[PDB]
Every structure is written in structure tokens, then in C-alpha cells.
Amino acid sequence: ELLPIELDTLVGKGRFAEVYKAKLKFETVAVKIFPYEEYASWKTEKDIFSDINLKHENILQFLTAEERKTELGKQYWLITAFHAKGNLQEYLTRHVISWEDLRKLGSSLARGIAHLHSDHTPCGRPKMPIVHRDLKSSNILVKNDLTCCLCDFGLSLRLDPTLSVDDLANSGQVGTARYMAPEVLASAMNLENVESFKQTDVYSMALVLWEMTSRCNAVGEVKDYEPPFGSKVREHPCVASMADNVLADAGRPEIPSFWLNHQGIQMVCETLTECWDHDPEARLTAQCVAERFSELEH
Ligand SMILES: Nc1ncnc2c1ncn2[C@@H]1O[C@H](COP(=O)(O)OP(=O)(O)NP(=O)(O)O)[C@@H](O)[C@H]1O
Ligand SMILES: [Mg+2]
Ligand SMILES: [Mg+2]
């Protein structure tokens, strides 16, 4: 029943798993390996990937989930399509992108998030909305055609009506501190409305769009890649230092006025600025962003 897989190289290592480029006797595949201790993370992702309504070009393509015995115990594997260009953060660190690349990455990112958020399939049927909860450039893969696809669903939440407010309350602050929405950092979320979790994803998406813009040659002069708040906080920032910047100081990544000379960049910057608003209700939806990116004909 186990697939003929040979592990080749370690390509990624997060808080829950190790990812390997491997061969399936498509030949090249990615293998996300979790130890037994991280079973809950593997099962959360496997449940998200197993849903028939998740399938989308801007969502990582899932092949299968397996259980594999080892000498020191057992491992839990998720086998997906391999994207040679790797995660978006590593891609933006090496490359300066063109305006065409920014339009492609930006719209494919918005389309993937809008699909996760949607309470219905493209064919009109009801579907469970999913909030990623850990949107960041390292959880986005760059496809060969220079479009995006979302990966890493280990912290994701299926917006089930049976969810208890007390069961959501702790949990607690989930995600990566650097990309947490101000209301997440303030512990000020209304643990009732379904849109409130979708709004936190939109703020994180806005930081990602800023990262893409910061490396686009259409701005003119391009600086070395830096993650959001790179010059304000340490490498692995705590929630308190992030609250001090994003909330107390109302801080956001810098948009120099010279970027706004290009009409496309100006529209992108106006869009993401609305998406990172302090007030979650003032933010655009991922569907609005995808629509604004489709309007970028001229
Ligand atoms: N299909 C894939 N193709 C290529 N690289 C991949 C693939 N899936 C994941 N990676 C890489 O492996 C890294 C870790 O994978 P990920 O699915 O984010 O694991 P994680 O432990 O849950 N990370 P995190 O929760 O963000 O700390 C990613 O950041 C990518 O660099
Ligand atoms: Mg990750
Ligand atoms: Mg993860």
C-alpha cells in the first residue's frame, strides 16, 4: 500500500515538519514528514487536503497521506507536487521581479485565499470556509509559470458552525507573530463573526503583497529583500514586540512615494494599504483584491 518513494534532499524545515524533494517510482514529489509528536498537525493538514472542494490551481496539489514505521517509532507523511522554485520568501531574496511577475503572483495569491474563504464552490454548491491563519511568504510556493500556490495548512481552521467561543479563546494567538493582524496582537477579536478570522488572513496577505512589491523593478530603484518589520524587530519576534510596532506605533512596512510613479504599483499599494488597515472592517476581502488585480489590463 505504501508508494515507491526515495528521499533525495531536505528543502524545508518548519515548526512542525521537514520537507524533502523525493522520487515516486510525475516522478519528482515533495514529502512533508511529521514525527509521531506532531500527529495533530499532520491530521489537521490531511483533513484540509482531503476535502474535495479544496482543489484549486492556487492551492498546493495533494497526492496522498501515509503512515511509515521507523526504528525510533513511526512517521506521518503528506505527499504533494514539488515546486522547484521553492517558497516565495527565498524566491524574492534571490530575484528582482518584473511588473508582469508581480501581477501574476499577486492575483494568484488573492485567488487562492478567496477560494479558501468562500462558503461555496465555483459551481454554486455550499462548502466550508477555511482560514489559513499562517499566511506568510515562506508558506507560499512559486510555480514554474510564476504564479502562487498556498501551502502549510497545519494551523488552518475550518470555519465549522459547531466551534465553541471558549474552544477558540485558547488555541490563543496562533500563527507567526511577524504577520499577526493588530486585533490578533491586541487579543481584541470578536470570537463570533465568521468574517473576523477571514479579515486576519487579509492583513497577512497585505504584508505578503508588500514583500512582492518591494522587489518589483517597476518601482525603479530596488533594495535588498527584507521581511516585513525587518529593521524594527529581532529574527524571531515575540507577540509583545510586534504589538509595540503594529498596534502602539501603528507601524506598517514603508512605501516610499517614488514607488507610486508607476500606475500599476500605485494601484497595488493602494489595495494593500486598505488590506492592512487597523480596523478589520475597513479591509478589502480577498475576492475584492482578486477583482482589482484582474482590472490591471493597462
Ligand atoms: N511542495 C513543496 N515544494 C517545494 N518546497 C516545499 C513544498 N512544500 C513545502 N516546501 C518547503 O518546505 C518549507 C516548510 O514547509 P511547511 O509546509 O511550511 O512546513 P511547516 O513545518 O508547517 N512550517 P511553519 O508552520 O510555517 O513553521 C516551506 O517553507 C518551503 O520552503
Ligand atoms: Mg510553513
Ligand atoms: Mg506550518
Side-chain angles (χ1 to χ4, degrees), residues 2-5 7-14 16-22 24 27-70 73-93 95-99 101-102 104-124 126-163 168-169 172-190 193 196-222 224-225 227-230 233-234 236-262 264-266 268-296:
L2 295 181
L3 287 174
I5 290 149
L7 297 186
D8 300 338
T9 324
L10 178 70
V11 291
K13 183 166 172 71
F16 304 87
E18 288 185 353
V19 179
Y20 289 81
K21 171 196 180 185
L24 169 76
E27 224 215 73
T28 318
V29 297
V31 188
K32 191 173 179 172
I33 302 166
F34 300 77
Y36 155 87
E37 288 84 4
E38 298 309 341
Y39 178 91
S41 179
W42 170 87
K43 203 238 171 25
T44 300
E45 318 206 25
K46 176 199 179 281
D47 288 351
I48 284 139
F49 279 130
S50 295
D51 185 351
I52 196 76
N53 299 325
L54 187 87
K55 254 265 174 296
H56 193 272
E57 52 169 49
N58 303 128
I59 291 178
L60 177 61
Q61 190 198 327
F62 177 73
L63 316 187
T64 195
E66 296 180 344
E67 302 189 19
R68 301 236 172 176
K69 196 90 180 74
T70 59
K74 188 176 256 196
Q75 286 178 344
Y76 297 88
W77 292 20
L78 293 173
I79 306 128
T80 68
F82 177 73
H83 294 296
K85 290 177 183 172
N87 78 60
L88 179 70
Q89 180 167 66
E90 287 164 354
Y91 189 86
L92 294 178
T93 301
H95 311 280
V96 170
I97 62 167
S98 74
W99 164 255
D101 290 342
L102 171 62
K104 273 152 88 193
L105 293 164
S107 50
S108 59
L109 174 60
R111 292 193 306 261
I113 298 170
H115 178 74
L116 276 186
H117 289 186
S118 187
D119 62 5
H120 64 275
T121 64
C123 71
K127 85 156 185 70
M128 199 142 292
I130 295 160
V131 294
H132 192 286
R133 298 211 298 182
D134 192 31
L135 288 166
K136 57 186 176 168
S137 53
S138 76
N139 282 350
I140 298 158
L141 301 170
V142 177
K143 295 156 106 195
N144 284 346
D145 68 344
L146 251 291
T147 58
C148 282
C149 80
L150 301 173
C151 78
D152 191 356
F153 301 95
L155 293 168
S156 299
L157 179 79
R158 179 98 68 181
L159 293 179
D160 199 306
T162 68
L163 286 164
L168 281 160
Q173 287 161 324
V174 346
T176 300
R178 187 183 303 275
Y179 292 80
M180 281 175 183
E183 69 274 23
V184 167
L185 296 163
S187 309
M189 281 187 81
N190 187 344
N193 46 318
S196 89
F197 274 114
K198 303 175 180 193
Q199 288 156 353
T200 68
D201 265 5
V202 167
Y203 168 94
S204 292
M205 178 185 73
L207 294 178
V208 176
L209 290 163
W210 171 83
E211 288 177 73
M212 292 177 182
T213 307
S214 82
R215 292 289 284 173
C216 182
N217 66 24
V219 306
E221 199 207 313
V222 175
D224 285 347
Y225 169 83
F229 315 99
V233 298
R234 54 179 160 97
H236 306 287
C238 58
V239 174
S241 77
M242 285 309 304
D244 293 353
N245 283 265
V246 178
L247 196 69
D249 295 336
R252 291 304 183 272
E254 176 177 68
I255 299 168
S257 53
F258 76 89
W259 281 19
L260 310 167
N261 295 327
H262 183 287
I265 301 282
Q266 178 191 16
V268 168
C269 288
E270 277 159 21
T271 305
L272 73 92
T273 296
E274 284 180 75
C275 294
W276 66 32
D277 203 285
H278 172 90
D279 180 14
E281 284 294 337
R283 301 176 192 145
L284 291 191
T285 67
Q287 182 52 41
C288 303
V289 177
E291 283 171 354
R292 287 207 184 177
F293 268 96
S294 75
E295 273 169 37
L296 287 163

